Design an enzyme around this catalytic site. Sequence first.
Site, PDB file in Angstrom:
ATOM      1  N   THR A  14      33.641  12.122  24.447  1.00  0.00           N
ATOM      2  CA  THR A  14      32.338  11.893  25.121  1.00  0.00           C
ATOM      3  C   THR A  14      32.185  12.985  26.160  1.00  0.00           C
ATOM      4  O   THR A  14      33.174  13.434  26.726  1.00  0.00           O
ATOM      5  CB  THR A  14      32.344  10.533  25.843  1.00  0.00           C
ATOM      6  OG1 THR A  14      32.103   9.489  24.909  1.00  0.00           O
ATOM      7  CG2 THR A  14      31.154  10.385  26.802  1.00  0.00           C
ATOM      8  N   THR A  15      30.947  13.406  26.415  1.00  0.00           N
ATOM      9  CA  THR A  15      30.666  14.278  27.543  1.00  0.00           C
ATOM     10  C   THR A  15      29.442  13.735  28.277  1.00  0.00           C
ATOM     11  O   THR A  15      28.415  13.499  27.647  1.00  0.00           O
ATOM     12  CB  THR A  15      30.360  15.718  27.078  1.00  0.00           C
ATOM     13  OG1 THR A  15      31.495  16.263  26.403  1.00  0.00           O
ATOM     14  CG2 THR A  15      30.229  16.630  28.296  1.00  0.00           C
TER      15      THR A  15
END
Lengths: 221, 221, 221, 221, 221, 203, 203, 203, 203
Positions: free
Chosen positions: I1-2
């Site tokens: 995830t970012t």
Amino acid sequence: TVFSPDGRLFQVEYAREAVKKGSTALGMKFANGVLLISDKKVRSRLIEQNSIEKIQLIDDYVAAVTSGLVADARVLVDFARISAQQEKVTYGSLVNIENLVKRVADQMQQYTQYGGVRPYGVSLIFAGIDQIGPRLFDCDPAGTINEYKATAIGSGKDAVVSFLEREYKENLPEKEAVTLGIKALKSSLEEGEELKAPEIASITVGNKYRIYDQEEVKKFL
Amino acid sequence: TVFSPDGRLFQVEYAREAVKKGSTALGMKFANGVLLISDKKVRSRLIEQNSIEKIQLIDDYVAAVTSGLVADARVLVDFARISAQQEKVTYGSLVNIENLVKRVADQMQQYTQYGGVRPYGVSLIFAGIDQIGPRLFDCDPAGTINEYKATAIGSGKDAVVSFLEREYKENLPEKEAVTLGIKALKSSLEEGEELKAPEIASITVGNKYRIYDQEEVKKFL
Amino acid sequence: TVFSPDGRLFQVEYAREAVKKGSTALGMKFANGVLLISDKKVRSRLIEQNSIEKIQLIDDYVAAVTSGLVADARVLVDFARISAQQEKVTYGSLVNIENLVKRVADQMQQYTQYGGVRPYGVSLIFAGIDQIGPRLFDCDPAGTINEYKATAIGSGKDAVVSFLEREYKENLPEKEAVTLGIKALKSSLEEGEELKAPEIASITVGNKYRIYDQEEVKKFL
Amino acid sequence: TVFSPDGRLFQVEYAREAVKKGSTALGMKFANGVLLISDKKVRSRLIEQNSIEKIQLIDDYVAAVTSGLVADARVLVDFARISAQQEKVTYGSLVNIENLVKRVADQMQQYTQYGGVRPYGVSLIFAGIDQIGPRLFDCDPAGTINEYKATAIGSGKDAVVSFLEREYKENLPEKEAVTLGIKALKSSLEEGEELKAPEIASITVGNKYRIYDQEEVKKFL
Amino acid sequence: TVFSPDGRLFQVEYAREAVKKGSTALGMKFANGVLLISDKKVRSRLIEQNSIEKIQLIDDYVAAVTSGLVADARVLVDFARISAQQEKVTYGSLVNIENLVKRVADQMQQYTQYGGVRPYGVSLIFAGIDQIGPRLFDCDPAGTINEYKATAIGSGKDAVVSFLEREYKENLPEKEAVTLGIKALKSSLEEGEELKAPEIASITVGNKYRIYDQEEVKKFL
Amino acid sequence: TTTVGITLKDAVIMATERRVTMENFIMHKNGKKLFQIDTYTGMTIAGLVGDAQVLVRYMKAELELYRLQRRVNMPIEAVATLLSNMLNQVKYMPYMVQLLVGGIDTAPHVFSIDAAGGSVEDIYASTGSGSPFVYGVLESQYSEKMTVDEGVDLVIRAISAAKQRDSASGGMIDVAVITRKDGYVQLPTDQIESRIRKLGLIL
Amino acid sequence: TTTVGITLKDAVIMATERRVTMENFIMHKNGKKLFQIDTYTGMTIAGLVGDAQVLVRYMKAELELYRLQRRVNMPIEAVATLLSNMLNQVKYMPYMVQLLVGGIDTAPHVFSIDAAGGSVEDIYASTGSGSPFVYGVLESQYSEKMTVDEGVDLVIRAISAAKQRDSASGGMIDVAVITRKDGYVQLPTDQIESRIRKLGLIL
Amino acid sequence: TTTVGITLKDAVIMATERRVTMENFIMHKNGKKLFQIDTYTGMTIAGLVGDAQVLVRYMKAELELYRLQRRVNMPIEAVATLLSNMLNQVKYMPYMVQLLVGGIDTAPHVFSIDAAGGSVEDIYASTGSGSPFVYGVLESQYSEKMTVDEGVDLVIRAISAAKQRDSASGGMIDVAVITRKDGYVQLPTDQIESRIRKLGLIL
Amino acid sequence: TTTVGITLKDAVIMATERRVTMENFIMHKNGKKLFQIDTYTGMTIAGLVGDAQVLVRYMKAELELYRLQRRVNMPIEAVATLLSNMLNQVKYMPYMVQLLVGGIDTAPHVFSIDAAGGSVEDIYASTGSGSPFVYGVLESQYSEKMTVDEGVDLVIRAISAAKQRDSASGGMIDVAVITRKDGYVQLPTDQIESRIRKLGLIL
């Protein structure tokens, strides 16, 4: 429920008045067996006759009839059914029916001693077979128990009991016991009232309960 | 709720007076099915009639209609709905509607025995299909239950029951059962008064409940 | 249960009235033992006699007889039986019967001090053998205890006690003691009266209780 | 709260008298929308006008107005707000406002059945938009619910409801509905008594609630 | 605390009588602030003058005065202090003082609805600064709240309120507001009776509360 | 342990052996692992004996109660569902058992229930350490067209094969047949012993 | 420990030895491991001593109470069922025991109950570290047709064999015979010593 | 196990196979893994069978109750949200399952729910040990423009490929089609068998 | 995830990607990780999806309730404090998440909250496996003087770089801009796609 100056519990006596309004039912012991018979105030062709029966199996070997407040009675039969199964799970069998009757009676006794609750307006007859033999007990709103050779509850009790005190014989054949029972129940009906078809159930040592169907009961009318 | 000297529970009898003030509703069994009809007190054109129905589905196979205190009735219908789902989760299905009715009646019985609560001011008719077949039950503030071929609750109960005792026939086709029920309900409106469109619901073996819409009801008026 | 201005607890005094209505029973100490005798309000050949037990074993060495409300009495007997077992499990034996009688009496005392409950309408006599020797105690609705050489409870208490006050002597042989007891009980009866077969039980140091059978009881009548 | 002999709950009827003393409020459905109008009991010029508003948002799509005991009312609005959020967390949305209203009404019903508490002295009108459409409900101290096209609560209820029964029709444009509501509210005033600026709020399908400002309201006076 | 036939809660009205007996206090908003002034009914040179104040800080930005049962008032002030700290721990700050006032009022409301307790015999004025601005609320035994520009509690309430309804102006400088407040309070006294040193506290936006010392108070007398 | 349940057109046959071991130690040669729990319903047990026996007691009690309350027998799928709920509810402190429930309502049914309450209906099933040997015999020999007599022979052959290859299985084979006509009926030992002879088998 | 229970036509015979160890340490040479718990009912204990002793007290108490309540003795199978429920209920905090319950109701019975409450009826059974040696003797020598005197000699031979090969077994052999006619009778030590002599054994 | 749910313009198709294994042991060839839970809502189950079956019972009951209370079907996203809450609430004592919920409200939806209550909507999804093989078929062959008949063929091809490469998958393919017009329709086995033949497939 | 949040003079910009993995398995290409939680307040989620989704629902509910009770929006620092209290209270049975809360009250704010309720304000912050790559880009290219248009390009550049190097990040970039004037505005996908093309990037 508190004591009067004469040592009476009037709320319990009043519960016993409710019982007196119920339909008459009786039990009697016979040769190797016991039976129950119950009258019913069948009141409308619109009712389903086969339902909300007066005689209720507690297990295959034990049955009860009741008189008095019908909702209270159902609660006590439900209690009796669950209490029987608890005993069967714990020990593997129900050796003496008197202990089951005592447990039901103790539940009723509690509701005469603690505030915040009224007594059950119910009398019961329990009948069945255990390791001692054919058994017949009654139980009243106070939780008072007696064991009998023959007994009755409900509005017609006194007439039925008087009849039996005179006519009852021990160790009758089932058929003759049923006949006597029907006769006893008839003796309690008012001026020209007709017995329209009671419930009958019986059990003999080594067998499970038998519930008579309507057509078999008719052969005794 | 305690016993009078005659063995009566007046608080329960009083709850039964509230039920007598409700709108008349009836049930009857017919050929492979059971139906419910409910009159309604329509007391303002500003009400949405399509809402707060007297007939309530408990599940797809069981419905109820009530008379008496409307908030109490809602609580009991909520209880019946959750109790039905609990049975369905535990066993996978609801085999005998009588047991659901008994659970609701037991809840009502408890509120006649314990201090610090008043009874529910409600009578109910339950109708649906189970494994036994089409079923029709009623249940009153005491938690007294009966099974019927036809029955009614509410203000018109006595008139509707009188009518049906004379005119009721078993195993009518649905249209004829409905006609009879409409006719029965109409006879309980004694003075020259018009029956507005009542609620009608019916179910037959192998099917789910259906609620008659506005126009189909009109066809019987 | 509250105090009157003279320091009395009338609800307990009223419970004591219930006890006066019960059947007559007595106990007496004799040479190396103690015995109990109970009369029975048997009325009706329809009753089972064998099931009647006014004398109730608490364990093999301790028995009780009660008078007053019969369902209340059953609850206290059940309590005494369980309490006796709890002591035997904890210590391996019951060294002094007085402690068991005190626990039963404390249960009764509690129901005279806390609101929301009524007192038990029961008096009990306990008799048995412990490490001190043969013991005889009574216990009333207040939970007042006394230890006795001889005593009685129930409707004929006053007549039996008067008789024993005059006729009792210590260290009689069992046969003589039972004879005295029967004569004492007989004295409490009204104008021209038997006295059907009562229950008799006795125990002597180093033995367990014995219950006299119907035929051994007949010898004293 | 117990039953009278005629089956009434007078403590609930008395709670209803408290509601009759509150300021008049009303709601009505219009074309794709619903609105609420509340009269204000504004006395002192020392009071902050913008505060303790009688119309209270429950969420962005649902609002309530109350009449009767104001502290009781706040408690129920708080309950409704938290109940709405609970449902939104569980399912992700509030599909049918009727269920929220029933949860509030169930809380009120419980305080009419259990001892130890008095009923809430409050009536509420709930109005908003859900998946069914524009909704308008009321709820009284008994926990009785109804769905309406138009309704009112508080002192002028009967006059407002009479006027609406005479004048209301479905699917009005918003301005016409507000105009009608104002006329209805003025119909409830005493002779020569001026209507001060009421609170008004409305919502239409696809939008969130809006509260009319004092200047918008003044245009209707 | 139950409803009378007219829908009143007399036990709450009676609690409000206790409040009328208290010493007069008042609050008013002025330019960017709010102040409290409390009459101190001094009754003996043997009392420590400077102890058990009528004006109590709830936190550095919020103060209260009370009237009525003093031990009840203490308990509510304690509750308010802890409730304020709970909010500040949860969110980091106390954004809107009205929520604090509602929590105190809800505690008071509960004691008007549940059995087993009597209402608090107390009214409170809360005054302080939050994110909305200067705030002034009162709260009575019912848990009824209102927001004000100026208000009073205690025996001289009616006179002080009358005076301020005539003489109060919004947005006064602090010194002019205090002067008006002292004048208002003096007008509530009985002729001949002289105002001894009252308590004065004030807070302005951007600042914490300040209590006026005995000397700065005199400058106004 | 070896247990088996098979369905045939209008009948269910269930069977087990009787060996109770602790590791290699044969403590009991005549354990009971086949029980009637209702008029037309039987159950077999595998796994921890104390756990299984408590469950048999609970089922006998509950099914009797239910029958009295409903005036009809619990449907076989309802018996399996009840057990499924009960066992799953304690999955983290489990009854360490594998159960077969077999019976007839409107149709014959066998369900296999695991210690987490997973329940799956099948035309036949087997449990215990000897079950794979049974599955071999049934894969090769079972036919949905068999008579009750042929089905009884089949389960005897299957369990005998398991006894030959599973040291945790042994003792007399117990067999019950369930029909609408006769309900649950445990076959007499003499009859099973007679079939073992006429099939030419051992023990 | 070694305990044994056998059934004969109208008799149950139960026997144990008396050695109590803490690992290899013989603390007590004369522990008691055989108890009358009812009129016609006996129990032997193996496993953790404190646990077993608590259960003996519980069983003596409960069977006495039950007897007074029911007016008949608890059936032997009911005794085993009660223990079964009790032990299974605490299976995760268990009584670390092996129990034999033996007695006469309408017939002789021996039940063996484990720490999880598993209970199995058998014609004979043995518990404790010495049981494998006993099972050898019984397998070789037991006959259902034995007289009480023959059965008494048998249990003496079995336990004496176990004493020779199990270091956790030892001390005097205690024996009880249970019949309807004579009730529960613990045989006097002098009688057992006499049989030990006449059988050519030791101790 | 292999399950799959796909969305098309106005339809949802969900499908599974039926194999239930314990390690390498194929205990049941015909387990049920696809369920109707509301009028236009289906669910598939993967993971621990007992946990998944409890959840199916809970969902059938709750959606039925909700429908009766609200007078409308629970929105598909609300079904996923409900499950998300229930599973997360017990995440430290979890239902060890992977679920697909698919159905139609105002539009088709497929949601995939994990054992911690993580719920994500997708155009298609697959669960169970066979899912990676399904995802290969779908990546290569799925089109948003497919007709229902084309979608049914696709899911059959996908699960058939999974059965060829995943030994924990097997048995007959179950397929349900959900539309506003026809509701939830489980396709007849005969129709699926016919498609399998025309597509030229096996097992 | 970012995920990323940055502050500018009178604005907050928040952005994430959409990939949902189990290990290397890309289960979902279009998960949602950026949420409006109040009028001028947004939140991003990283970590265990079920935990984060519960917290999104809780925050939406509580901030709405608070706004209705207080008649003003919860201050952004108050949002972070509430979260800090909630997460810390269960630190030993935690929500396994990293959260960014961003918004405008009297000024722009970004707060980063960890699984033990540690909460720190910053001018910019990033969470998830892709965050180190994001911090590289921001350290090199962030300026407090950037316009909203410049900041939007920056976060798109940052997440695009993270997607190149973090296999647990991927999918379409979602961006929201928060201002007093326009409130919370999620940027249309076509606009972000156009910026990606114009900046010369991928996916």
